[PDB]
Design a protein around this ligand. Sequence first.
Ligand SMILES: [Zn+2]
Ligand SMILES: [Zn+2]
Ligand SMILES: [Zn+2]
Length: 79
Amino acid sequence: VHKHTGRNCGRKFKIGEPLYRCHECGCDDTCVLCIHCFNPKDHVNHHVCTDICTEFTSGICDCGDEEAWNSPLHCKAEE
Ligand SMILES: [Zn+2]
Ligand SMILES: [Zn+2]
Ligand SMILES: [Zn+2]
């Protein structure tokens, strides 16, 4: 399971995969969540940007890295 209780997700994105950013929740605009972690319940009427990962925008999921977020998140994998 994609659960990562007690630590950061750190799941590396692949080309073509969805990445989730939130204007208000994200510390900065490099702060991202993977599909397994992003919980819509955390972001009702938030300005959520879901992009498709390309060759350029390569990185990792920030779920569970509390320094990357302004609000406490509730991992979707944990459900
Ligand atoms: Zn994740
Ligand atoms: Zn997570
Ligand atoms: Zn949000």
